[PDB]
From a paper:
Herewith, the bridging enzyme PfAldolase, which binds actin in addition to its role in glycolysis, plays a key role: it connects the actin/myosin motor to trans-membrane adhesins of the thrombospondin-related anonymous protein (TRAP) family, which are expressed in a life-cycle stage specific manner. The cleavage reaction leaves the extracellular TRAP domains bound to the host cell or substrate, while the cytoplasmic C-termini, also referred to as TRAP-tails, remain bound to PfAldolase, from which they are believed to dissociate and be recycled for degradation over time. TRAP is a competitive inhibitor of PfAldolase as the binding sites of the glycolytic substrate fructose 1,6-bisphosphate (F16BP) and TRAP partially overlap.
Numbering used by the authors:
A (entry chain E): 7 to 16
B (entry chain A), C (entry chain D), D (entry chain B), E (entry chain C): 5 to 351
F (entry chain G): 6 to 16
The structure:
């Protein structure tokens, strides 16, 4: 759904 | 009506600007920065041992824009004033070469840099005088988007960039963008922060975040439609003389974080500048940025050095190497195109 | 180091604020606003002829928080300071009823509104004095996020909201949030613009954009982590006494457009306030907002009126109606949960 | 050293600018504004039915600057670019005529007005591009101070002047001032607020104060040396179409009050523009201003209409009327000279 | 009406404020700052070895305000909240002792300093909550003017004071001022810049100028009446640890220069703080400032250390040394009173 | 410059 950044963020 | 607020743009104008802006950042496509000035393109011809004549400048830009199949990776090409009203050997205008390849003509509208008084050689960009008149001229010539380059320096010891430098940059970009939108041109806002210095990548992130905050602030006070605009910032990287080793993922992380903290989603996309980066690293870093999942905006490229450096070396001002150099242009264009998908391997 | 820039938060603190911010806007969840003052909650008991006592207030919050299965739709509950330390008739702390339902406790931390001098009764929010001390105590009481309500009025003839009203609101919000993040509390920034007046929905869109642009500018200058923060704005609607008829799609479009122009992607969520809207209006409008494709941030709800209105009448201040009232709460909680998906269609 | 601040000017330059500024506002002397453009001076020649040629423009300027004894009442004369490099019938440069009466040459350095996008025809001033280069050749030709005209409009119904209009005017003025001072030109900052409209004198005072506050803020941010600068504001008066009658006492009081609240004492002097006021009323109002006791800065004049209206009518483009016109000029020169003392009477 | 601008105060309130503010800085008189908090007054009692009791604080304040002939050199006396409602050993109200000498009672209305998040221990001043109500309370007790202390630090290497620190102090001072003026209290604006560090007197001049520019800017935006207010800044001096020694003439000049560049003449007076300066140096420096000819505003004093240091040592908490200490007070009061005329010569 | 006619008719 969201970007990979958001997934790795928190 | 609230009155004390920037008035809206006419529906037709705002509609066209939004279309062009999104089309320039179309999936897998980027922007070719071929708007080098006379003294700028001179230093390029000197490296490959070539005389800087009007015939050679025409011939070189003809090689770029006359590349069959360039439109697959390039959505738009930024031109210098001379090139916009120029024709090649066959008699075909440079603009028509772009039209045949689905490439949108762009124009550099800035008049160069000038030192700001009471500062340590911090630069300011000129070109507001008669800008609206030139925009009307450029549009009828075929241009559909414009560009305006401003420069900031990071020098923590000297407190660079100072508030005066940041705000003059921001307001300068602000005025320029509003005038272009008024005259049916998509403004490419370029607040370039130089990577010159030994500053770490963390410092660059803080500075870029601070500058972008002021840039967009100035943008909204002049009432610039973000939907019809583009941003041309530098990648958040460590200094050129920095000692702390930084990987390409460190570049990608701190760049995405910086943009997400400052850039509203209304902006259709962001076109990075290659700067002093090598051709390959400019593609690797752009790939590292797009490898971090689908972003709210299109994070593509507005390269000039990263697309033309190897082309000039192959061409060397000789006709027998034109097709040979055009293939070099295509493989670099494809390289950065795959970088937009995050599907660009090292080699 | 750039020095002239707001410092970073400690890694551990900023991390907790980020994950808490994420949990508050979980997919299909929102926030229950039960932070009515003892005077605001009085006028609600006047509609069901109930004594405004601490006993009745205890039984009412118990009805809301004691609801099983409420955690599937509610991610967080905003409380008044009284309820945070209050116990039910059975002797169980209110904060524990939330913990059992996995609902995150929240606290209203502002001290109300006061008039701004030299303004036509424009409001300023107080609560900065000793705010850091209270946040530390609230955190030890179970609260993980806070709330600060500011109020702006739209009156085009009087130029409302004026710049002083806008800036004082923005700077006050930024001041409160930086203190909350320092004390491990996720700040909910609430720049509520009243829907009072005959202004059109276009006017509200203009004002909201101007306000949000000023709000977020203040947050950056105070170095507030957007990753660990919430926005609680009003839905872009026309005034109550307006005569220009608009549908829920108009509300949906001009709300999304406004947020996309002003709110950075770093902000994980946006919790809309119900305001003067009815229970059905708040759900349909929220549905229309989310029906416009996927968003960079979470566009959910922080409702109080839209969740507790039918519950009050059903309860009627009686124990035998507790079981009946809690189901009404679930029905409406789910109704807005589906709205976040953009799949809520009443009928 | 504190880096985040505008750097100082070289000692030799700052001292020269300070000296020139003081000399321009010496006791009993004002500035002659004869910098009418080719298009504006055409309007003045049409009222006397005179052909707008280079021959007549030179002849008229020769009439003004060739007037013996003018230097006793005039400390400075503002020129257009044409006049600066112009000579009379005898081949004598106009600047040399000013030197003979010890009148300091000044040059208009702005490029006129352009509309600000997203505003209701609110104006912006051009002239920044290549300003530094022109300042160098203007100084070489004899100019020791410069002027930059900006325009704001009072329309309370449309919220004029808007925030965008104010800051663009303010920042544009500051930018021009710092450039001039760098090239040893004493900048005359002119934020003219038009008196067109039915607004009261109280409204004009509110607007003028707000504008001047923003102007000097921009000046400090750009590092403009106030000691080597002059302010060219409008007199605080009621609108041209205002019903509420206001005598010269009302103009004087509200003008001085506005100036005391916003202009720092470091500014050596303030030159009032005549605007659309009549020759006599311009002198009376100026007198009423200085009648209000001694001021921390010099409150003199920089008139054009109030010094040339009757001179043109006496001249009528005739050689045999030069003597009669030059004596009318001296009369108006002395009249306004007495006004700065607060000792001017009707007859 | 222009609407988008701070409203004006009622004619009655504005007139009383202007009278009081002018009377506070009357010729040859200054303000006694005896508003040390219960915590601050302790460490001053510890130096003379005395218990910080309710009686000792009362007895000491009675010594100061009971001094007959003090009204000759003192126009105003700033009190702490406690002293304002206190009585002496004879049961006589402290405010009555000031009334007998006809010294205007003043009150400290801020609530100390707290750390600004994301800064390096940079201070924010609290006390806005319920300020309006306390101002009414203080006014009825006898207060006619109030104070509010803010602190800035000069650290060139760390970029202190940062931007955030500057406009947080400025906005806080502005907010406090408008509230006090609304409640018939003359606000004393104190943007105290600490002299800690090795920075030169030139750096201090630059920093102070930047601060005052933003301070007064915030005052204008909040509609603070300059005619009914007073500024309490630091003398432009070098740091305590600075090597390049600066004579009192350097202190006097660069202090006046800074004020003339930033402070509008509408402000009736400037009351300097003693700071860490000795009693003698505070008198000498103040004298050097006034020795620089007549000033647009009054340049007097608002001392505490430079008026109470020798008084405490003489008193030593003993009832016997009351008369002996009061003669010391008058001696140091006259010394600073003569400094306002520029007629104080230590020898 | 703290005793002008403007100031004498103000405070
Ligand atoms: O002309 C350009 N840059 N001038 C570079 C330059 C010139 C002179 C000196 Cl001394 C140094 C430098 Cl870095 C330019 C043109 C188009 C672009 O898209 C762009 O990013 C830059
Ligand atoms: O409702 C609230 N305040 N009272 C508003 C109000 C004013 C005037 C009249 Cl006539 C009615 C009403 Cl309802 C309120 C209190 C605390 C909150 O966190 C919140 O979101 C809202
Ligand atoms: O509270 C005051 N001074 N406390 C200073 C101080 C103490 C201890 C530490 Cl650790 C730091 C600091 Cl800055 C004060 C209050 C009102 C006044 O009029 C005044 O002149 C001073
Ligand atoms: O030639 C000028 N054009 N300025 C615009 C202008 C002129 C005349 C009328 Cl009626 C209206 C307008 Cl908007 C000019 C006029 C006065 C000056 O002080 C100056 O430096 C230039």
């Amino acid at each position: 759904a969201a970007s990979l950044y958001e997934k790795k963020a928190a | 009506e609230y009155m004390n607020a920037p008035k809206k743009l006419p529906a037709d104008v705002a509609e066209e600007l939004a279309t062009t802006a999104q089309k320039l950042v179309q999936a897998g496509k980027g922007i070719l920065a071929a708007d080098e000035s006379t003294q700028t393109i001179k230093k390029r011809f000197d490296n490959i041992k070539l005389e800087n004549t009007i015939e050679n400048r025409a011939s070189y830009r003809d090689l770029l824009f006359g590349t069959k199949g360039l439109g697959k990776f390039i959505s738009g090409a930024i031109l210098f004033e001379e090139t916009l009203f120029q024709k090649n050997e066959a008699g075909v205008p440079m603009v028509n070469l772009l039209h045949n390849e689905n490439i949108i003509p762009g124009i550099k509208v800035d008049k160069g840099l000038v030192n700001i008084p009471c500062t340590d050689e911090e630069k300011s960009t000129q070109g507001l005088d008669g800008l609206a008149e030139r925009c009307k001229e450029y549009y009828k010539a075929g241009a559909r988007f414009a560009k305006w380059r401003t420069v900031l320096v990071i020098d923590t010891a000297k407190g660079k960039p100072t508030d005066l430098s940041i705000h003059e940059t921001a307001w300068g970009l602000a005025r320029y963008a509003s005038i272009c939108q008024q005259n049916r041109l998509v403004p490419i806002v370029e607040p370039e922060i130089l990577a010159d210095g030994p500053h770490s990548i963390e410092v660059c992130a803080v500075v870029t975040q601070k500058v972008l905050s002021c840039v967009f602030k100035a943008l909204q006070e002049n009432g610039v439609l973000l939907e019809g605009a583009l941003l041309k910032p530098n990648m958040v990287t460590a200094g050129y003389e920095c000692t702390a080793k930084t990987t390409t993922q460190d570049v990608g992380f701190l760049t995405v974080r910086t943009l997400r903290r400052t850039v509203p989603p209304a902006l259709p996309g962001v076109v990075f500048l290659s700067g002093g980066q090598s051709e390959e690293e400019a593609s690797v870093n752009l790939n590292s940025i797009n490898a971090l999942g689908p972003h709210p905006w299109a994070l593509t490229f507005s390269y000039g050095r990263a697309l033309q450096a190897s082309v000039l070396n192959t061409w060397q001002g000789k006709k027998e190497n034109v097709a040979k150099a055009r293939e070099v242009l295509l493989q670099r264009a494809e390289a950065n195109s795959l970088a937009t998908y995050g599907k660009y391997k090292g080699g």
